[PDB]
RNA sequence: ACGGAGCCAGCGAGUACAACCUUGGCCGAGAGGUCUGGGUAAUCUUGUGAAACUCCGUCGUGCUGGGGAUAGAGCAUUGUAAUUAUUGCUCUUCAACGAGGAAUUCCUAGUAAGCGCAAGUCAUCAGCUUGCGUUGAUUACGUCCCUGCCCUUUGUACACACC
């Protein structure tokens, strides 16, 4: 029967959506990738030098599908963990804002994310349709 | 006491910008909810204010 | 109206509200099926009522659980207790007495918390120490 | 998945910018062993040079070394930003450079002797060997060793 | 000619309970007496106004603190009710301590 | 090289306005001068220009004493001798071309060095 | 700041042909295979321990019992 | 006058402290006992409980 | 340890005769900047999408990708004013540190411990304190041996009382 993103494991669905977005030539990566920490909390760029932006976009799209609507600051709160503040106690450091802004604009160009009246951005019918389609892809991929 | 120089230093903020409202002191001040009463006078007048020892 | 009731299960600060209806064997938590509980290694904890009772006991019964508050494992135990209590309450309300008593015998003979909420809750902290019931340190010199 | 790695060509020692570097370490962390180059800067230099990140420094070829070397002396040519550079705005001539193994320590020494000569408080504190950035010294750094 | 319902709202505050509950009960009884439709005295989380304070005025002595506090109870009420009787209710049955506030919201 | 500050040569350093140095100066100076200026540094500049003018062109100009430590040394200030308040003494300092960018406070050591034993 | 251990390189940072015939020869006869077990015999550095360990899942030389991260559990194929 | 309700109650308490201490300072010769602050829709009544009521009135 | 991905709280607090909590949209790599919109508060920040934690990879016993002290340069914020680095951010040097002697501290269940968040200091600043919640144990369930405490009996040349 029909299948939503809630019926598929998070990590596998996100990996498959990243792979599918990477395979097709859409979802342009900003020219400043390979450069950025992705947050003040981190101290190195992603280990996967190329393709990590697709993973982040997949995670963002799944997050907007699951939740009500999400802006950029909320994603900054979501991503980013604890900064090793040298010899001081760790705290919570918000993620980089430019990366998430570019992710949301790229998702807008792909048509998967729509601007919501209540502020932030919500899921769009076409994009959520592709999300269910690739959730089915992963689910019948499992067995 | 030239008016240009007397009390000329700004006092918009910091330790001495606000006083105790009881004693005029600048130490041990309680700014919570706009009390602006220092701790000892707060301990004295808490019951009159509405604050009680409860748990 | 559809025979359906609502129960709940709590942990330290977790709370799972479970609606039980006469369905088709449909068990979802937070809109996701039980097989994908937030963690992974306490998954058997949340299957535990299923396997202790036997799935065929509730094959035409559907489960919807919304779990909020508390950390991961507290939420998991909340879903555990919520599902167990929902099954027991539904069987009491609409099925039969002996069925509910047999479910309670299968449950309470195993991890009593399955039907009884845990009594332990955090101890308030006190001045003179960084812990709820610990002191800072002494110097003596 | 795995390769024999062509016995007889895998280098074990290298001399990039007149410092001996062991080649068996991962490329980025092997480059990290030269003064003025850290894990972040070496990682970015390796990324721009297109050499494999998970490769071993003792197994990449010679023109790879010279291309990496060329990238990591004039970074601004290869789209390394104005920031992320070691010494930016360069208060001798205003051109954002990046100091390296000998150059880093040497130029730090000229900056130190400039601060000594300028008779700045920071300079005389440096000349004395005391803490500079304004830390308490009653209990901090009470042992030379 | 004030037949237009103002969908008025009555909210309360206090640092005490019995007087506030008494005022709310009198308000509800008055509303029922004149056949008024209402949403009941909905309870609001008692906001605990807390200050921690060191006991020693001079710092000397074993570290001992204390916590003073009040609670504020709100219990707002809204009425889909006529004009004059509602206002007359607001200007009557007032107890010191409990504070009454009225919002027309029409 | 003899001296360049940030690519601007010493010869250009003597004859050059404050604002160009602000654009050349680091971020802290940029914010300080962009945040508005007190009248006291302007008066110090006026007095120091007068002192430079007064000197018969071939000796070290007369020392100008000042309590101000929070303002910095602009290119117009070079060639000048100022006594920066130290708490007691208006400590002497001649303003060299490498003064620039810094404050005066770096050259009036508010504490005496500590010697043990 | 000590010097007590006095450890050598003690690890094949790069695999060699003779070492390849080795890893393949006792790819069986090692009734339990893991990263630490593989490097215990001095023939693997530890990063390529995972490389050769994942490579053996090519023609069913060994079987997986659990594939959790941070380690691996493999038995000889029977 | 718009202000947070918790802050408004705190201000009411500190105002009562104001009044009580001021009356203690002033009516001390009157055998001052206490003060009650009642708030009506229009008037802020201030009842003074003291011994020498007729002298307090003056 | 480091990369991604999962995504879970409870105490709070928050602007008026002042300028607080900040969502959201654009910029910047980040700190941050700007434009708007909510919230005098179960309404908005806020479900405070917090860390530890979980899954998949890189690392592989090397003072090493641990440790981040000490410094060099630059970018911003608060501030009349930041040098004697306020604080935040970016690149680099990366020190001592190998589970720490005598000795000594706290603690018997949501306890200790790990982990963070809020509030008080606050124009800016915590490694502090007061509270709160997450994950959550080993070992007692006894004794007067050390340190003391309570009652009784006894002795005293002590009563500023075994200092
Ligand atoms: Mg994360
Ligand atoms: Mg992690
Ligand atoms: Mg750490
Ligand atoms: Mg604790
Ligand atoms: Mg590290
Ligand atoms: Mg919450
Ligand atoms: Mg988080
Ligand atoms: Mg290191
Ligand atoms: Mg303190
Ligand atoms: Mg005991
Ligand atoms: Mg005697
Ligand atoms: Mg004696």
From Swiss-Prot, chain B:
Transmembrane segments: none annotated. One of its GO terms (molecular function) is structural constituent of ribosome. GO terms for biological process: cytoplasmic translation. One of its GO terms (cellular component) is cytosolic small ribosomal subunit. InterPro entries: Ribosomal_uS14, RIbosomal_uS14_euk_arc, Ribosomal_uS14_sf. Keywords: Ribonucleoprotein, Ribosomal protein. The keyword Ribonucleoprotein applies. It comes from the Eukaryota. PANTHER family: 40S RIBOSOMAL PROTEIN S29. Belongs to the universal ribosomal protein uS14 family. This is Small ribosomal subunit protein uS14. The gene is RPS29.
Swiss-Prot record, chain C:
The keyword Ribosomal protein applies. Residues 132-141 have a biased composition (Basic residues). GO terms for cellular component: cytosolic small ribosomal subunit. Keywords: Ribonucleoprotein, Ribosomal protein. Residues 121-141 are annotated as: Disordered. One of its GO terms (molecular function) is structural constituent of ribosome. Pfam families: Ribosomal_S9. The keyword Ribonucleoprotein applies. GO terms for biological process: maturation of SSU-rRNA from tricistronic rRNA transcript (SSU-rRNA, 5.8S rRNA, LSU-rRNA); translation. SUPFAM superfamilies: Ribosomal protein S5 domain 2-like (SSF54211). NCBIfam families: PRK00474.1. Belongs to the universal ribosomal protein uS9 family. This is Small ribosomal subunit protein uS9. It comes from Kluyveromyces lactis (strain ATCC 8585 / CBS 2359 / DSM 70799 / NBRC 1267 / NRRL Y-1140 / WM37) (Yeast).
């Amino acid at each position: 029967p029909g299948v939503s993103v809630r019926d598929v494991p998070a990590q596998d669905f996100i990996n498959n959506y990243a792979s599918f977005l990477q395979r097709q030539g859409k979802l342009e990566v900003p020219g400043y990738v390979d450069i950025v920490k992705t947050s003040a909390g981190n101290e190195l760029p992603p280990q996967d030098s190329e393709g990590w932006f697709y993973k982040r976009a997949a995670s963002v799209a799944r997050h907007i599908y699951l939740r009500k609507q999400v802006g950029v600051g909320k994603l900054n709160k979501l991503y980013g963990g604890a900064k090793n503040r040298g010899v001081r106690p760790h705290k919570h450091v918000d993620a980089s804002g430019s990366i998430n802004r570019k992710v949301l604009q790229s998702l807008e160009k792909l048509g998967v994310v729509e601007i919501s009246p209540k502020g932030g951005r919500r899921i769009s019918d076409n994009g959520l349709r592709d999300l269910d389609r690739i959730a089915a892809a992963t689910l019948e991929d499992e067995e | 006491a030239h008016e240009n120089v007397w009390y000329s230093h700004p006092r918009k903020f910091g330790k001495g910008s606000r006083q105790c409202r009881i004693s005029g002191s600048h130490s041990g001040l309680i700014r919570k909810y706009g009390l602006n009463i220092d701790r000892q006078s707060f301990r004295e007048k808490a019951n009159d204010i509405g604050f009680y020892k409860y748990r | 109206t559809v025979p359906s009731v609502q129960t709940f299960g709590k942990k330290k600060s977790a709370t799972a509200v479970a609606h039980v209806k006469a369905g088709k064997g449909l068990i979802k938590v937070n809109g996701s099926p039980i097989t994908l509980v937030q963690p992974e290694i306490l998954r058997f904890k949340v299957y535990e009522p299923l396997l202790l009772v036997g799935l065929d006991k509730f094959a035409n019964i559907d489960i919807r659980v919304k779990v909020t508050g508390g950390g991961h494992v507290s939420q998991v135990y909340a879903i555990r207790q919520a599902i167990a209590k929902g099954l027991v309450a539904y069987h009491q309300k609409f099925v039969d007495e002996q069925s509910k008593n047999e479910l309670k015998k299968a449950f309470t003979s195993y991890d009593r918390t399955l039907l009884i909420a845990d009594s332990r809750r955090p101890e308030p902290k006190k001045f003179g120490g960084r812990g709820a019931r610990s002191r800072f340190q002494k110097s003596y010199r | 998945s795995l390769v024999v790695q062509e016995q007889g060509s895998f280098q074990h020692i290298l001399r990039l910018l007149n410092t001996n570097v062991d080649g068996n370490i991962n490329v980025v962390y092997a480059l990290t062993t030269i003064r003025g180059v850290g894990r972040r800067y070496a990682n970015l230099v390796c990324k721009k040079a297109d050499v494999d990140l998970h490769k071993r420094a003792g197994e990449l070829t010679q023109e790879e070394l010279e291309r990496i070397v060329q990238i990591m002396q004039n970074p601004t040519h290869y789209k390394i930003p104005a920031w992320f550079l070691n010494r930016q705005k360069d208060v001798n001539d205003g051109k954002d450079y990046h100091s390296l193994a000998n150059n880093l320590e040497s130029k730090l020494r000229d900056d130190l002797e400039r601060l000594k000569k300028i008779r700045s408080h920071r300079g005389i504190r440096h000349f004395w060997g005391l803490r500079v950035r304004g830390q308490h010294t009653k209990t901090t750094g009470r042992r030379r060793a | 000619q004030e037949v237009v319902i103002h969908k008025i709202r009555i909210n309360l505050t206090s640092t005490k309970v019995k007087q506030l509950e008494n005022v709310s009960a009198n308000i509800i009884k008055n509303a029922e007496t004149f056949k008024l439709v209402k949403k009941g005295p909905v309870r609001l989380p008692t906001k605990v106004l807390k200050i921690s304070t060191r006991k020693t005025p001079n710092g000397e002595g074993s570290k001992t603190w204390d916590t003073y506090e009040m609670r504020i109870h709100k219990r707002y009420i809204d009425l889909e009710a006529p004009a004059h009787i509602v206002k007359r209710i607001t200007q009557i049955t007032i107890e010191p301590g409990v504070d009454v506030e009225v919002i027309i919201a029409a | 090289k003899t001296y360049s500050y940030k690519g601007v040569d010493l010869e250009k350093l003597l004859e050059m306005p404050t604002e160009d140095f602000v654009k050349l100066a680091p971020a802290r100076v940029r914010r300080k001068f962009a945040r508005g200026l007190s009248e006291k540094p302007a008066g110090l500049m006026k007095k120091l220009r007068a002192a430079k003018l007064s000197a018969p062109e071939n000796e070290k100009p007369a020392v100008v004493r000042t309590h101000l430590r929070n303002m910095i040394i602009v290119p117009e200030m070079i060639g000048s001798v100022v006594g920066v308040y130290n708490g007691k003494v208006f400590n002497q300092v001649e303003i060299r071309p490498e003064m620039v960018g810094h404050y005066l406070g770096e050259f009036s050591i508010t504490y005496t060095p500590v010697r043990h034993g | 700041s000590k010097k007590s251990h006095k450890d050598k390189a003690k690890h094949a940072v790069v695999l060699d042909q003779d070492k390849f015939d080795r890893i393949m020869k006792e790819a069986p006869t090692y009734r339990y295979v893991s990263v630490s077990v593989l490097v215990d015999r001095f023939k693997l550095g530890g990063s390529l321990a995972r490389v050769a360990l994942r490579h053996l899942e090519n023609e069913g030389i060994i079987k997986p019992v659990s594939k959790h991260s941070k380690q691996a559990i493999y038995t000889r194929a029977t | 006058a718009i202000i947070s309700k918790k802050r408004k109650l705190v201000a009411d308490g500190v105002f009562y402290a104001e009044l009580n201490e001021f009356f203690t300072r002033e009516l001390a010769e009157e055998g001052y006992s206490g003060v009650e602050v009642r708030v009506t829709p229009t008037k802020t009544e201030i009842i003074i409980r003291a011994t020498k009521v007729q002298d307090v009135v003056g």
